Amino acid sequence: KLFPWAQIRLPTAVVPLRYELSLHPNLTSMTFRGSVTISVQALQVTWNIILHSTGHNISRVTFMSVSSQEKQAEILEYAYHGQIAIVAPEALLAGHNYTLKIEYSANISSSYYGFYGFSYTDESNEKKYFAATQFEPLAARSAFPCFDEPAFKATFIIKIIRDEQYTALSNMPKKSSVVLDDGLVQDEFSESVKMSTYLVAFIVGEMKNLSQDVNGTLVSIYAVPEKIGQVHYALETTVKLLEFFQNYFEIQYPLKKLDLVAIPDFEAGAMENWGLLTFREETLLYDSNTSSMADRKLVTKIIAHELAHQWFGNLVTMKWWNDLWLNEGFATFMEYFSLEKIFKELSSYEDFLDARFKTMKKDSLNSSHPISSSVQSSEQIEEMFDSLSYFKGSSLLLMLKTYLSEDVFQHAVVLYLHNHSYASIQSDDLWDSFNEVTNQTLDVKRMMKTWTLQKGFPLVTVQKKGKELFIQQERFFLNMSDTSYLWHIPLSYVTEGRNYSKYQSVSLLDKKSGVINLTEEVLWVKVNINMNGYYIVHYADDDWEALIHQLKINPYVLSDKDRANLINNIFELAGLGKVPLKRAFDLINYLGNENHTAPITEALFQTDLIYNLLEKLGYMDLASRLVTRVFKLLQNQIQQQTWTDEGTPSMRELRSALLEFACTHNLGNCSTTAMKLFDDWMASNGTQSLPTDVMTTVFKVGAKTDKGWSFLLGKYISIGSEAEKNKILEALASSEDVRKLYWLMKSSLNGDNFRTQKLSFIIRTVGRHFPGHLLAWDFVKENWNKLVQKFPLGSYTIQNIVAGSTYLFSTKTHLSEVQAFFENQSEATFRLRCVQEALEVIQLNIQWMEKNLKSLTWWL
Amino acid sequence: LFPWAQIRLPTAVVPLRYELSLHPNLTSMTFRGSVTISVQALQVTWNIILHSTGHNISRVTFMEKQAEILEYAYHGQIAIVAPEALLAGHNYTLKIEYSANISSSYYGFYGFSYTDESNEKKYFAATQFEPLAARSAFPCFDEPAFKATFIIKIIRDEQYTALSNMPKKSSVVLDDGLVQDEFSESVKMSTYLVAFIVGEMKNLSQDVNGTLVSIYAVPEKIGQVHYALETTVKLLEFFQNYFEIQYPLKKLDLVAIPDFEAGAMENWGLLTFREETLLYDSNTSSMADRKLVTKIIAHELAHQWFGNLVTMKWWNDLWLNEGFATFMEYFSLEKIFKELSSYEDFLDARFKTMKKDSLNSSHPISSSVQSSEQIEEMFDSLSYFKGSSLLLMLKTYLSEDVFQHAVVLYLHNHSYASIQSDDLWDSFNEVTNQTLDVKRMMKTWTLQKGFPLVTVQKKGKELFIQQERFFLNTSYLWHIPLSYVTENYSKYQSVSLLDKKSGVINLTEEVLWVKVNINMNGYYIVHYADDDWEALIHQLKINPYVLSDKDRANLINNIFELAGLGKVPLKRAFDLINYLGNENHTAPITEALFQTDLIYNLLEKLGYMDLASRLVTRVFKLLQNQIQQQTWTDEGTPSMRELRSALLEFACTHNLGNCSTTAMKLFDDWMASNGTQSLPTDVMTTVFKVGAKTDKGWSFLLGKYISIGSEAEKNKILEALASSEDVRKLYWLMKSSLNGDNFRTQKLSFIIRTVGRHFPGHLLAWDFVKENWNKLVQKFPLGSYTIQNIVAGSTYLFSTKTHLSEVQAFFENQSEATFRLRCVQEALEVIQLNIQWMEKNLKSLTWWL
């Protein structure tokens, strides 16, 4: 047979309007039966209706006009694009409506994509079942035949026949649960709002709810009976944020109910389905005592993210997958925005600032690609799911929110959504909304497009001569060729004048060079206030010194953000070479008076990275000298740490940082205190509570003794707190018993005492420290086929593994070895971004040493 | 523009006498030279061609008229062009005056510095000419074939005791303060055995029969050369009795040179040794120490006949004397030093040769040498040991008495002349009366690589015998002397010469078990048809003492070897060794412990820890009684205390029962005593090993190594430090030793070897070799015995295709030379062979260890 469609995209010809879907899922037998009624509308004359289906045993297919007589239509198949074509026995005329009915049988998914299912072991030793969905991106067509593209928005009637013991859920509220004569229940849910096919949702599980009503909408967290006590905070928070987003966006959450569900499975699909927000149990659970600081921040973030998406993504969808970064970028921004507004106390701007640092690092590589690309096949569609894009977007919106007013941003947003509700959008449409709120004073589209269409970010260079501030732009490239790179850069700047004459302004650098006229002569100048702009700034020798000297006199004239920024940049610029590593260590000598966590963490991140690179070569004196030096600057702040959980989240994070550093390197009191804490804890059979802020540190010091290691392993297999288990595992993997380390990796690959999902984390941890450095990479090498079977070549896990196991190499010999090995696999494995990023990194490492290593001896 | 373009000198001119006058300064490394060569032309030739390198020719006169010099440094030659035609039969006198620098690389005429007991910068100088280094010290006809007589005279300072081949004739105090020693005219000898030593030494001489035997050590260390003397005396007698040809020179000096990089050579009358290899203490040295000193003295002594008296013509036949010295090394000991049980060493060494010779990397010992560097290749223990092995086969095939007569004759028939390997075989032809060919027989051994697999089948009163190449993965035919032994309790034994691919032997009686190759006197591994293995396997269980320890250990080795090549399943190998509960002989127990450690270490590296730990618990369960009986002393015969070290070192290594604790108890005492309270030398390494497992013990031992005087104790301390499970200390050891920081660069190879045998240091040792390749190559040149040992020690446990690919790739990226190198192709071969071992044997093990 011949197929009438030879394209990845569906034709514009026919358009869905309504969807009546009835399903009969049998979770114990992991199969289902389904019936779809699709009301379409033709626009062009056609003799075929091409839409999406996969893994469907089609029982009956019937076509209609109005004539209530169902006419038997023939169905064609083409598995390559997951398409089916319906041959209609009557031509379909423009404007005319038609209704298609399809009946089918299918399997509930073994994987955790599509309509997936699993079984869990209840608190009663009683084995239970559960089914859910995860359609993003291309998985709704697995669940039911449909038009599976974001632009084809329709309404949905969802009906499932469940079993009485189960709570069945879906997008909309439950219209009618009507008992069937055999012990089965035919649940019906109200007809949905005009929405995208990938956002359709349903869940069948034995579940409890915790509920509350906010204005009209009834928010509800559904958890498994045995863990409903742990979703209190979840709801409490979803209340605060829903309030906020509705107030911010000024468009009201369009449904009467909002459900969040803590799925009891680690591999589970977590996403922002309209009204049915899915999450991994793990990522929603919170105990107001027994949980961590990072624990609060994490779930508070994920709720925000998934909620922000309700408006940015579900109400205003992207026409196609090439604009995903816009919706995830927005969600990832509101993630941190909303949290400053409501959870100011969390200090999540600290996390956001780190994220941004980490993004820039990965973006500045040759391996990086622009966020705005042309996406054709299912591979390029799945390639669009990477935090780099999400985070670059996030960053670009902050740069835009800081350039225009806070209030200007909001009103563009408000206009954007309102104007485009229940429609499909292109990236530009957002910029156009920004264009109009600026009274055409800026372009924004022109401006943003320089960021979105180009890889990487610019390096701004700054020179002060009198009252003249000279700005220069250039692509921040790390040595290893074109000049089309020009970014429209919102430069902010801050200054101190005629004795504590604080001044600040902003100016657009749309050209390769320019000059700012300063109102008066200044002692120092700082560009990119709070690193709100996605760029690195380099300074002329005397301008750097102007900042290096200021930090020594009073660093508090600058924010913790700016101060962290300077610490980041100088170390990055030392890497490039535009500044000697000396100056880098010069700038950070101010640290004695630094009491804010952000700059201290960044200094620690920089110095631990250098330490480990040198450690891995034979240079152990330099490595030690480096650590004693840094310890000296932070001696007081370290000696000031109480081993507790008291203080603001920020200063709680400072404790975990300063204590880990000090313990890792066994400096002063640290080891002995943690060991006493460890012994006491072991002695309680682990029944004594340890302060969450000092847990990992304490556990590590423990694991350094067979007794400790053994007890920890014991507790890992016994206890039930997953987060405590991860902190426990970190310690085990931080041992210096090469044999133990090996065992831990072997075990996780065999899924033996640790599940395979933990493997990358084990490899990352082993590979970081000296006794397991070569071990970790050898394990990766020799177990390559078993790894690639267990995580597909292109998954995030395998990228994590390759990075984790190789990023600390810095010799031509290792470069040779690494390359060789992937060349010895195939050419398709050796062409993978993660393999090319790997080898780019080893080169940059080699280049780092052959630029900074020899001079090192003579200081620190 | 130069006449002679060839490696080997012209036949035409020939040396007779040498007037060698040297004025060497010890402080400055330079010397003034004068040689007068009295020659004789055998053809009428226009120019004299000889060897000379690194010489500034002051005056070159020919007699009384000056002659024009020419140079071709590529061949290391110089040409003297004669005024007249040198007419055949006529003697002429060639005299050269030259300047040159005293060597530092411990080759040619070398020297060094050392600090005294009183801590002073004393000097010393010496020679190492073999093969090609006389050319550098003095011009001459530097080939072994050209024998002559040597009058050497060296101008020395008053404080130095300058030595040479022949005894000192005179000494005249010059007007400068300087003393000029002259040494007697030498016997007719090859240029490469000419030697001279200038240094501040004491003597310990003791007449035997006119010829004065003397051990020359530095002043402070004269107390340890007593065993040395005692031993040379005994041995000298022996060889004079056995070879029945009196040691020619009036003197015999064994000098203990005060450096670890000195050259040890069998120079006629002036035997050079590394200080360490002769120093012995009857209280504080172990059995291996005692064997080592005894063995080496003998080796160099055997040479005074085999390689000095009777020399070889060209370098290719080196294996012969070297093999003979190596055999005599073990014979002499078995006759006079009988209690040392050194046959255990000879057997072991035989086995290890066998393993290296069983590779495609192997070369036949009778190759042709033409290349400047092919000469250096002839220096490898594989050629010396093979030679040794087959000399042994021959001794045992013919009579011990027949053997001797063939020797005595050859030495007489060839005294002071230059031979070829065939000449030894010729000398065997007549003692056999041309019954046995011998000459054609030995040629089947020496001209083709490897050795035979004699497969055996027994049916009634007859045993069937086929032979083939022993290849692990072509037609090779050896003339194999098959000694065998059978068993109402009828202990019958016989030989049979097999010269064809297939054979059959007739038996007097039908027999329970047969055992081919008695005491493994023959350089072949024997396989049996299934029920013949079981026959031997049963006997070992029933009563193993019907066979010798030698036979027993031979079986142990053969079955495991075969098991790798797949002619036997590994289960059957392990089945054989199940008799070990009844074994009280050290020979077998070591060979089993060796075999099982190799498997254990191969497994452990691949991560099969349980399988590896089941393996050692099995072997332990067999040797349980023995281990438990042993005392923590030195009380026992040399063989039995060799067993003490073996059993205790096994049991401690794997933390089995009694050991760890007992050894830690002896550690904690010794450490507390600040290292003074004596430790039995048989438990020492095992005591230190257990101690070095703590940061306390490790740091103490380190403090000792840098501080204590005994090198023998030091080497036991380093092996323990390198036995630490902390990758940081291991890395450090290799690092420190490369920069020569607290451990000389000489010890490096030993550290890398030790580090990469254990799990924490396995990837670390090889990584260090790759990352310091260039640096390793400067310290030890390509083809060095050290760099071969390094590439082996760090790669021999890699048993995966990924490793094999990596190892290859690495060397390829170095050079085509580096990549097409003996040890580099060998290493890769060994990896595949490990790979092949796994795919044959790994899957089965789960079910039966």
Ligand SMILES: *[C@@H]1O[C@H](CO)[C@@H](O[C@@H]2O[C@H](CO)[C@@H](O)[C@H](O)[C@H]2NC(C)=O)[C@H](O)[C@H]1NC(C)=O
């Ligand atoms: C060549 O030189 C050697 C000596 O260098 C001569 O050999 C000596 O000859 C005499 C008799 O003429 C003997 O008594 C000596 O014993 C020989 N000494 C040695 C060391 O061999 C030889 O005769 C000379 N030949 C010619 C042709 O003049």
Ligand SMILES: *[C@@H]1O[C@H](CO)[C@@H](O)[C@H](O)[C@H]1NC(C)=O
């Ligand atoms: C569901 O699983 C069965 C297992 O036999 C398989 O054969 C079939 O392909 C699946 N059903 C459909 C409609 O794909």
Ligand SMILES: *[C@@H]1O[C@H](CO)[C@@H](O)[C@H](O)[C@H]1NC(C)=O
């Ligand atoms: C039928 O088509 C007309 C447009 O041609 C449209 O206005 C109407 O809403 C459609 N009705 C249904 C039920 O699809």
Ligand SMILES: *[C@@H]1O[C@H](CO)[C@@H](O)[C@H](O)[C@H]1NC(C)=O
């Ligand atoms: C599924 O099938 C099983 C066994 O036939 C039955 O016990 C159960 O009630 C069914 N449930 C549903 C929801 O169809």
Ligand SMILES: *[C@@H]1O[C@H](CO)[C@@H](O)[C@H](O)[C@H]1NC(C)=O
């Ligand atoms: C490096 O970047 C340039 C673009 O500036 C590109 O053409 C080239 O293919 C890149 N190479 C690699 C290995 O990424």
Ligand SMILES: *[C@@H]1O[C@H](CO)[C@@H](O)[C@H](O)[C@H]1NC(C)=O
């Ligand atoms: C800076 O000042 C000069 C006059 O000195 C003027 O020409 C220029 O336009 C000024 N730039 C800005 C941005 O105001």
Ligand SMILES: *[C@@H]1O[C@H](CO)[C@@H](O)[C@H](O)[C@H]1NC(C)=O
């Ligand atoms: C940190 O210290 C300085 C003075 O030493 C002070 O001005 C500043 O307020 C401190 N930081 C905070 C957050 O209190």
Ligand SMILES: *[C@@H]1O[C@H](CO)[C@@H](O)[C@H](O)[C@H]1NC(C)=O
């Ligand atoms: C430690 O506590 C757990 C209960 O949480 C228990 O299962 C385990 O047996 C305890 N061990 C001892 C030795 O009391």
Ligand SMILES: *[C@@H]1O[C@H](CO)[C@@H](O)[C@H](O)[C@H]1NC(C)=O
């Ligand atoms: C001695 O050494 C110097 C270099 O130190 C060298 O130039 C010279 O050729 C040597 N002299 C002789 C006579 O060999």
Ligand SMILES: *[C@@H]1O[C@H](CO)[C@@H](O)[C@H](O)[C@H]1NC(C)=O
């Ligand atoms: C070696 O040279 C030094 C002076 O350079 C001198 O004191 C010593 O006597 C010399 N020895 C000889 C044997 O020439």
Ligand SMILES: *[C@@H]1O[C@H](CO)[C@@H](O)[C@H](O)[C@H]1NC(C)=O
């Ligand atoms: C050293 O040699 C001389 C003879 O040259 C001898 O008289 C003396 O006894 C020897 N010294 C010793 C300690 O044997």
Ligand SMILES: *[C@@H]1O[C@H](CO)[C@@H](O)[C@H](O)[C@H]1NC(C)=O
């Ligand atoms: C001692 O030397 C003489 C020759 O001077 C020799 O005849 C005799 O055989 C030798 N005796 C011994 C026992 O070696």
Ligand SMILES: *[C@@H]1O[C@H](CO)[C@@H](O)[C@H](O)[C@H]1NC(C)=O
């Ligand atoms: C002595 O040597 C010659 C070869 O040079 C040999 O042919 C001859 O057979 C030998 N004679 C004896 C008696 O060993």
Ligand SMILES: *[C@@H]1O[C@H](CO)[C@@H](O)[C@H](O)[C@H]1NC(C)=O
């Ligand atoms: C063995 O004996 C048989 C007669 O029983 C005889 O024919 C044969 O020649 C003998 N074989 C050998 C190798 O002596």
Ligand SMILES: *[C@@H]1O[C@H](CO)[C@@H](O)[C@H](O)[C@H]1NC(C)=O
């Ligand atoms: C070993 O034991 C056997 C008896 O089983 C005995 O004949 C032999 O002498 C023993 N050997 C030693 C060295 O103990």
Ligand SMILES: *[C@@H]1O[C@H](CO)[C@@H](O)[C@H](O)[C@H]1NC(C)=O
């Ligand atoms: C241990 O003894 C050695 C000499 O044997 C001495 O040098 C060292 O100082 C002693 N150690 C202590 C701690 O006194």
